[PDB]
């Protein structure tokens, strides 16, 4: 029920143990006034310091002047911090504002079009994002709702995504969660304790060419629909062949235990794991941090559900992009469709109680 | 606790303690064959027995013949029972099928049109419902997804609602949850411990007119959108005046503690609690069992949120209808809009390991 520290060299919510729930919001900026946006960033940081400690924003949820609206909307009263993290990111489109054009990081690359894409533009992109992760979905929702309210008049919510359960791990010592295809998802990721791998594959360094981003990371979000009806008709062997792992234990093919290292040549040439593995991608490695979603029905008798994929990396160009390109022939493609997309530069951490989101940029 | 028992004189998921999460599905029937539908009810019941004990349906999620689809889709492997309950209901429209027209309960009344309704017909009604409640949302989702899969060919999913947090209580000894307007919601309800109140206000009795429904209940669902942006601009006093209780403690006006009984005359005439209270409605009393939701954004730059309201009663005509009618002048109406609705007859419980959902209706 405990708290994750908000301050650090890095933002929390990346290497941190993956919490059970997600509320992710993409915002568009409506002010053209740089000072006003800086003011918002500071007010949001202050709010985030309270929220992540389980406290109400501002002057609280009640007990203020009767004629004033409460500063905090109140639906988290009585709850716990619940490992809430709030992680901000800046989209490419933000850099067209506030005289920022020349500070857009080269490693914040626009994604190419990928075969199969059916992207909903209204649920793609965004000038900025806030990732709220917590074990209690109401804590996460409360955070986003209050940050949106604070930003009234300066930002709007472009799109938002609830993730009801995690499909990712940065803690290999704990149980790997399952996605809605019924497979464990997160076995071979990056652990929060793997400081060398995080430096190599996740955190931007000053020498990479964008100083303000040192200690930050780059995020790719992909809303991925699952063709549940088609999947659920497939045989056990078909499903296992798609991935290259068995379903129940989640071991690589021919192995008895989940965390045994794969022998890729024993998997089908189009197996997901074989195509996604670093060895198949010139060493490219991701920190995957996604969650499952369900968004009602298709209007035509079927549940709609999928996976809101999130990947952190030191450079989009050496992380997500090469790996996704190598999934052009993936056997998984029969059963999924990417339907939303965004990229964001996630700045370095809030160093202390005087610091503020985006201070290295602004 | 870990698990809630599935069998009983009553279905679980009504008087039982309110779990943290909800997946609610309304289904429409596609088969015209009554035997085929009875076979589904039995297969569903068997599945529900496994799911509510944390076990996979059928022969499991793996380990079967390689060339066969697994019986269970696998996403609950490694999870806990999570207090899962599965509660089935039958909509008015079901009774137009399978020669049933004359067995529709009179207490399963269609709702009147209410002032301010803006019902999306695609997210209203349904021949059947399954309410899945659990502390782990993936346990609930897995159950709905698997029930839908087992049923496919005989039923489809008309509409689906995830409730990410509860806004209701059947356990006064525990903390009352808050809705997305930030108020405690469930203080004056009907508790699971109030066995006589349940008999008076929640369970159908044999002499009420519909023998097969004895030990069942009638459910009203209302999807209620909240105008969060408008509410959040209202003063603390305005918000407290809307309900009749203070926000932080949730006490009635003029009282110090949440559970102090309300003094209705001290509330505004249009206050929600004053209009909803049994004293204002000829004694009518509900078992409210709803949950919060958020489903993306509106057209227009704002989070989309509300309350998926659920009410159980012994008769829709003497429970939800009079109370909701009395809410015509509610101060709350400024900030809410009913956008989906359905009613269901929730049959009696699955008595034992040989019984099946709906056995008293079908024979
Ligand atoms: C709905 C979509 C997806 C599903 C259901 C899925 C499922 C899985 C599963 C079951 C595994 C094996 C266990 C593990 O995490 O080690 C896995 C591995 C992995 N996936 Fe995916 N995945 C999806 C999309 C993607 C995308 C879009 C990418 C990258 C562009 C990706 C990259 C990876 C990588 C890098 C691994 C680890 C390979 C290794 O080093 O062994 N996945 N995925
Ligand atoms: C989004 C919509 C709604 C919200 C936010 C809401 C909120 C509340 C709140 C905060 C309370 C006070 C605490 C409590 O005793 O539970 C309350 C009481 C109550 N509400 Fe609502 N409510 C809503 C809709 C409804 C509807 C649709 C009905 C019935 C048709 C209803 C019936 C009641 C009843 C019976 C009480 C208890 C009154 C008493 O006996 O003291 N509510 N509600």
Author numbering:
A (entry chain A): 55 to 416
B (entry chain B): 55 to 417
Report text from the authors:
Dye-decolourising peroxidases (DyPs) are a distinct structural family of peroxidases possessing an α + β dimeric fold that houses a b-type heme coordinated on its proximal side by a His residue. The soil dwelling bacterium, Streptomyces lividans possesses three DyPs; two belonging to the A-type and a third belonging to the B-type sub-families. The two A-type homologs, named DtpA and DtpAa react in their ferric heme state with H2O2 to form a two-electron oxidised derivative that is an Fe(iv)O heme carrying a porphyrin π-cation radical (Fe(iv)O[Por˙+]) – termed compound I.34–36 In the presence of a substrate, reduction of the porphyrin π-cation radical results in the formation of compound II (Fe(iv)O), with a second substrate molecule reducing compound II to the ferric state. By using an A-type member of the DyP family (DtpAa) as an exemplar, we combine protein engineering, X-ray crystallography, hole-hopping calculations, EPR spectroscopy and kinetic modelling to provide compelling new insights into the control of radical migration pathways following reaction of the heme with hydrogen peroxide.
The Y345F variant, creates a DtpAa protein with no Tyr residues within 15 Å of the heme on the distal side with the double variant, Y345F/F347Y, mimicking the distal heme Tyr arrangement as in DtpA. High-resolution X-ray crystal structures determined to 1.23 Å (Y345F) and 1.27 Å (Y345F/F347) resolutions, corroborated the desired amino acid changes. The X-ray crystal structure of the double variant reveals that the Asp358 side chain undergoes a positional change, relative to that observed in the Y345F variant and WT DtpAa, enabling for a H-bond network to form with a newly appeared H2O molecule and the Tyr347 phenol group. This arrangement mimics the proton acceptor architecture identified in DtpA, considered important for creating a stable YO˙ species. Not surprisingly, the fastest hole hopping pathways (τM 10−3 s) in the Y345F and double variant remain dominated by the proximal Trp/Tyr dyad. However, in the double variant, a hole hopping pathway is calculated (P3), with a τM value on the same order of magnitude to that calculated for the Tyr374 pathway in DtpA. In the case of the double variant (mimics the Tyr arrangement of the distal heme in DtpA), a lowly populated EPR signal, with a maximal intensity at ∼3 min was detected. The line shape and position, albeit of a low signal-to-noise ratio, are consistent with a possibility of the signal being caused by a YO˙ species. In the double variant, although the engineered distal Tyr347 is present, and indeed identified as the YO˙ species in the triple variant, it is minimally populated.
